[PDB]
Design an enzyme around this catalytic site. Sequence first.
Site, PDB file in Angstrom:
ATOM      1  N   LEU A 116       2.768  13.129   4.369  1.00 22.17           N
ATOM      2  CA  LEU A 116       2.351  14.155   5.333  1.00 22.17           C
ATOM      3  C   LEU A 116       1.056  13.729   5.983  1.00 22.17           C
ATOM      4  CD1 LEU A 116       3.102  16.915   6.554  1.00 22.17           C
ATOM      5  CD2 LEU A 116       2.039  17.999   4.589  1.00 22.17           C
ATOM      6  N   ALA A 170       0.832  -1.212   0.000  1.00 23.98           N
ATOM      7  CA  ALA A 170       0.000   0.000   0.000  1.00 23.98           C
ATOM      8  C   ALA A 170       0.856   1.246   0.000  1.00 23.98           C
ATOM      9  CB  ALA A 170      -0.935  -0.025   1.237  1.00 23.98           C
ATOM     10  N   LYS A 171       0.253   2.352  -0.428  1.00 26.02           N
ATOM     11  CA  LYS A 171       0.949   3.638  -0.375  1.00 26.02           C
ATOM     12  C   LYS A 171       0.518   4.528   0.777  1.00 26.02           C
ATOM     13  CE  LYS A 171       1.335   3.254  -5.344  1.00 26.02           C
ATOM     14  NZ  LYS A 171       1.588   3.936  -6.638  1.00 26.02           N
ATOM     15  N   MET A 172       1.454   5.173   1.456  1.00 26.57           N
ATOM     16  CA  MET A 172       1.141   5.988   2.636  1.00 26.57           C
ATOM     17  C   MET A 172       1.479   7.430   2.363  1.00 26.57           C
ATOM     18  SD  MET A 172       2.671   5.280   6.436  1.00 26.57           S
ATOM     19  CE  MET A 172       2.084   6.147   7.866  1.00 26.57           C
ATOM     20  N   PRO A 173       0.548   8.363   2.578  1.00 25.27           N
ATOM     21  CA  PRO A 173       0.885   9.782   2.384  1.00 25.27           C
ATOM     22  C   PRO A 173       2.010  10.197   3.334  1.00 25.27           C
ATOM     23  CG  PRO A 173      -1.467   9.489   2.517  1.00 25.27           C
ATOM     24  CD  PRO A 173      -0.837   8.203   3.020  1.00 25.27           C
ATOM     25  N   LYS A 176      -3.105   3.276  17.197  1.00 24.46           N
ATOM     26  CA  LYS A 176      -2.069   2.619  17.974  1.00 24.46           C
ATOM     27  C   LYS A 176      -2.683   1.882  19.171  1.00 24.46           C
ATOM     28  CE  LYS A 176       0.703   6.684  16.914  1.00 24.46           C
ATOM     29  NZ  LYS A 176      -0.260   7.814  17.211  1.00 24.46           N
ATOM     30  N   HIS A 223       1.999   0.950  20.197  1.00 25.87           N
ATOM     31  CA  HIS A 223       2.314   2.345  20.471  1.00 25.87           C
ATOM     32  C   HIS A 223       3.665   2.543  21.157  1.00 25.87           C
ATOM     33  CE1 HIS A 223      -0.017   6.315  21.543  1.00 25.87           C
ATOM     34  NE2 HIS A 223       1.276   6.604  21.351  1.00 25.87           N
ATOM     35  N   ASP A 254      -3.040  10.809  12.050  1.00 28.57           N
ATOM     36  CA  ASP A 254      -2.388   9.952  13.041  1.00 28.57           C
ATOM     37  C   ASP A 254      -3.186  10.007  14.334  1.00 28.57           C
ATOM     38  OD1 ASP A 254       0.104   8.290  13.928  1.00 28.57           O
ATOM     39  OD2 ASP A 254      -0.169   9.837  15.514  1.00 28.57           O
ATOM     40  N   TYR A 268      -5.085   9.026  23.201  1.00 32.51           N
ATOM     41  CA  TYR A 268      -5.257  10.471  23.050  1.00 32.51           C
ATOM     42  C   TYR A 268      -6.663  10.869  23.466  1.00 32.51           C
ATOM     43  CZ  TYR A 268      -1.004  10.029  20.091  1.00 32.51           C
ATOM     44  OH  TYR A 268       0.274   9.738  19.623  1.00 32.51           O
TER      45      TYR A 268
HETATM   46  N1  NAP Z   1       4.014   7.347  18.665  1.00 30.55           N
HETATM   47  C1  NAP Z   1       4.085   8.104  19.741  1.00 30.55           C
HETATM   48  O1  NAP Z   1       4.510   7.750  20.827  1.00 30.55           O
HETATM   49  C2  NAP Z   1       3.901   9.616  19.517  1.00 30.55           C
HETATM   50  C3  NAP Z   1       4.442  10.541  20.504  1.00 30.55           C
HETATM   51  C4  NAP Z   1       4.305  11.937  20.324  1.00 30.55           C
HETATM   52  C5  NAP Z   1       3.633  12.381  19.160  1.00 30.55           C
HETATM   53  N2  NAP Z   1       3.114  11.434  18.255  1.00 30.55           N
HETATM   54  C6  NAP Z   1       2.259  11.875  17.062  1.00 30.55           C
HETATM   55  O2  NAP Z   1       2.947  12.965  16.436  1.00 30.55           O
HETATM   56  C7  NAP Z   1       2.111  14.140  16.321  1.00 30.55           C
HETATM   57  C8  NAP Z   1       2.987  15.387  16.227  1.00 30.55           C
HETATM   58  O3  NAP Z   1       3.777  15.518  17.469  1.00 30.55           O
HETATM   59  P1  NAP Z   1       3.385  16.520  18.685  1.00 30.55           P
HETATM   60  O4  NAP Z   1       1.947  16.676  18.795  1.00 30.55           O
HETATM   61  O5  NAP Z   1       4.181  16.015  19.856  1.00 30.55           O
HETATM   62  O6  NAP Z   1       4.046  17.937  18.300  1.00 30.55           O
HETATM   63  P2  NAP Z   1       4.427  18.796  17.010  1.00 30.55           P
HETATM   64  O7  NAP Z   1       3.666  18.362  15.838  1.00 30.55           O
HETATM   65  O8  NAP Z   1       5.905  18.838  16.934  1.00 30.55           O
HETATM   66  O9  NAP Z   1       4.055  20.252  17.573  1.00 30.55           O
HETATM   67  C9  NAP Z   1       2.670  20.560  17.699  1.00 30.55           C
HETATM   68  C10 NAP Z   1       2.685  21.999  18.331  1.00 30.55           C
HETATM   69  O10 NAP Z   1       3.146  22.869  17.319  1.00 30.55           O
HETATM   70  C11 NAP Z   1       2.230  23.921  17.098  1.00 30.55           C
HETATM   71  N3  NAP Z   1       2.245  24.216  15.677  1.00 30.55           N
HETATM   72  C12 NAP Z   1       1.799  23.448  14.616  1.00 30.55           C
HETATM   73  N4  NAP Z   1       1.974  23.999  13.455  1.00 30.55           N
HETATM   74  C13 NAP Z   1       2.572  25.208  13.741  1.00 30.55           C
HETATM   75  C14 NAP Z   1       2.973  26.205  12.827  1.00 30.55           C
HETATM   76  N5  NAP Z   1       2.850  26.159  11.488  1.00 30.55           N
HETATM   77  N6  NAP Z   1       3.551  27.298  13.483  1.00 30.55           N
HETATM   78  C15 NAP Z   1       3.727  27.446  14.853  1.00 30.55           C
HETATM   79  N7  NAP Z   1       3.312  26.446  15.715  1.00 30.55           N
HETATM   80  C16 NAP Z   1       2.737  25.327  15.114  1.00 30.55           C
HETATM   81  C17 NAP Z   1       0.875  23.366  17.504  1.00 30.55           C
HETATM   82  O11 NAP Z   1      -0.006  24.400  17.944  1.00 30.55           O
HETATM   83  P3  NAP Z   1      -1.634  24.419  17.650  1.00 30.55           P
HETATM   84  O12 NAP Z   1      -2.045  22.994  17.633  1.00 30.55           O
HETATM   85  O13 NAP Z   1      -2.130  25.258  18.807  1.00 30.55           O
HETATM   86  O14 NAP Z   1      -1.732  25.158  16.260  1.00 30.55           O
HETATM   87  C18 NAP Z   1       1.270  22.502  18.724  1.00 30.55           C
HETATM   88  O15 NAP Z   1       1.450  23.314  19.899  1.00 30.55           O
HETATM   89  C19 NAP Z   1       1.227  13.953  17.606  1.00 30.55           C
HETATM   90  O16 NAP Z   1       0.142  14.863  17.614  1.00 30.55           O
HETATM   91  C20 NAP Z   1       0.918  12.444  17.474  1.00 30.55           C
HETATM   92  O17 NAP Z   1      -0.084  12.343  16.432  1.00 30.55           O
HETATM   93  C21 NAP Z   1       3.216  10.060  18.364  1.00 30.55           C
HETATM   94  O1  47D Z   2       2.319   8.404  23.830  1.00 27.40           O
HETATM   95  C1  47D Z   2       2.163   9.358  23.070  1.00 27.40           C
HETATM   96  O2  47D Z   2       1.897   9.236  21.786  1.00 27.40           O
HETATM   97  C2  47D Z   2       2.296  10.821  23.470  1.00 27.40           C
HETATM   98  N1  47D Z   2       2.759  10.913  24.859  1.00 27.40           N
HETATM   99  C3  47D Z   2       1.855  11.203  25.799  1.00 27.40           C
HETATM  100  C4  47D Z   2       2.176  11.228  27.096  1.00 27.40           C
HETATM  101  C5  47D Z   2       3.562  10.938  27.500  1.00 27.40           C
HETATM  102  O3  47D Z   2       3.941  10.928  28.679  1.00 27.40           O
HETATM  103  N2  47D Z   2       4.414  10.640  26.478  1.00 27.40           N
HETATM  104  C6  47D Z   2       5.766  10.272  26.836  1.00 27.40           C
HETATM  105  C7  47D Z   2       5.830   8.776  27.099  1.00 27.40           C
HETATM  106  N3  47D Z   2       6.908   8.124  27.250  1.00 27.40           N
HETATM  107  C8  47D Z   2       6.788   6.793  27.352  1.00 27.40           C
HETATM  108  C9  47D Z   2       7.752   5.838  27.631  1.00 27.40           C
HETATM  109  C10 47D Z   2       7.326   4.523  27.597  1.00 27.40           C
HETATM  110 CL1  47D Z   2       8.496   3.263  27.798  1.00 27.40          CL
HETATM  111  C11 47D Z   2       5.983   4.128  27.512  1.00 27.40           C
HETATM  112  C12 47D Z   2       5.019   5.103  27.346  1.00 27.40           C
HETATM  113  C13 47D Z   2       5.450   6.427  27.273  1.00 27.40           C
HETATM  114  S1  47D Z   2       4.349   7.785  27.047  1.00 27.40           S
HETATM  115  C14 47D Z   2       3.988  10.640  25.185  1.00 27.40           C
HETATM  116  O4  47D Z   2       4.820  10.370  24.306  1.00 27.40           O
END
Ligand code: NAP
Ligand code: 47D
Length: 314
Positions: free
Chosen positions: A14, A9-12, A76, A109, A42, A47
């Site tokens: 952005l 599959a293809k993933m965007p 996730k 996750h 995402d 969340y």
């Molecule tokens: N897999 C995981 O463990 C994990 C962990 C962390 C994050 N993620 C995913 O990654 C996504 C992105 O990471 P994140 O939410 O940590 O942070 P991010 O995308 O690095 O930063 C989001 C912040 O940046 C601000 N922002 C966005 N666009 C902007 C722009 N053009 N100019 C100035 N400020 C801007 C947003 O404000 P406003 O929203 O107020 O505009 C918000 O405060 C998450 O939402 C989640 O979907 C996954």
């Molecule tokens: O999980 C998300 O997508 C966003 N997020 C929200 C809260 C937060 O504290 N974290 C930091 C975490 N660190 C670990 C570290 C490990 Cl080992 C397990 C879980 C987490 S959660 C976070 O990344």
Amino acid sequence: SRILLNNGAKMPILGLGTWKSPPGQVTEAVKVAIDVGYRHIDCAHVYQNENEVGVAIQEKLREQVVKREELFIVSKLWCTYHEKGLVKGACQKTLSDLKLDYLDLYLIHWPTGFKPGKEFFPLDESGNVVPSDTNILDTWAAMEELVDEGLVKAIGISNFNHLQVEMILNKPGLKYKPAVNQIECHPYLTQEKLIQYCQSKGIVVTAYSPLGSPDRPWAKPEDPSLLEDPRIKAIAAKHNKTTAQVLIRFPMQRNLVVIPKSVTPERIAENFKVFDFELSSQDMTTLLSYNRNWRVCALLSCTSHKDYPFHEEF
Ligand SMILES: NC(=O)c1ccc[n+]([C@@H]2O[C@H](COP(=O)([O-])OP(=O)(O)OC[C@H]3O[C@@H](n4cnc5c(N)ncnc54)[C@H](OP(=O)(O)O)[C@@H]3O)[C@@H](O)[C@H]2O)c1
Ligand SMILES: O=C(O)Cn1ccc(=O)n(Cc2nc3cc(Cl)ccc3s2)c1=O
């Protein structure tokens, strides 16, 4: 605009992030995002806003703004559902909340399983997370079942270090390779070693917190700020782009997927306008040079879990 995954599959490349998007704002955020061209969202159960994300998805499907096949919806499995008998229910709750009959991609996750129960982060009386005795390999087998049952088109992992990726790749009887590893990645945590490793194995890497997560709840006023770094602003200025646009384009040119979060309609649109310019190779190397091994997502209460991913070098 899309990258080919190892499931065909293809993933965007952005997508829109949704962690911290308030529930009262994220439906409009997702509707605006689809209207201005996003096709990947995402999500995650943890969340606590998948129902509201799902209202937006369903309205744009019903409105015939987009077809389901053109969307790429990612969610996730949370850490309290690593047990084999809990994974399908956890996926089905996400599906029901998002109002979908399949996910395009479902991720483990984090590599750490936590004790099941109502609490997302079960703690003992001294604040340590309470693990579960599940391991990543049995959880992976449960994820493979979801592919075979039609609930998800692809499975992947998130916050796995390279030894943990290697453990999945070397799982006895492995049926589906992970399609994606979604990890923190930005100019202050460039991840060269882990990205190289994953790409050499045909695993696509998704960069999260590409703007440094300025709204993360544990931010301290003294912390580094990508969006305010004058070196990055200067690169932006040279290309007549914003700093956020340079931070989004950077991972795209490393063959990564990137998922900036916003609930601000103007920034949602700004963040998508990243397909009409190129950083130079020199710009890319300079951006890479700002690496400081600075990690936004690494919760202290989880550091003694056996599978905590960030003690390893990568
Ligand atoms: N897999 C995981 O463990 C994990 C962990 C962390 C994050 N993620 C995913 O990654 C996504 C992105 O990471 P994140 O939410 O940590 O942070 P991010 O995308 O690095 O930063 C989001 C912040 O940046 C601000 N922002 C966005 N666009 C902007 C722009 N053009 N100019 C100035 N400020 C801007 C947003 O404000 P406003 O929203 O107020 O505009 C918000 O405060 C998450 O939402 C989640 O979907 C996954
Ligand atoms: O999980 C998300 O997508 C966003 N997020 C929200 C809260 C937060 O504290 N974290 C930091 C975490 N660190 C670990 C570290 C490990 Cl080992 C397990 C879980 C987490 S959660 C976070 O990344």
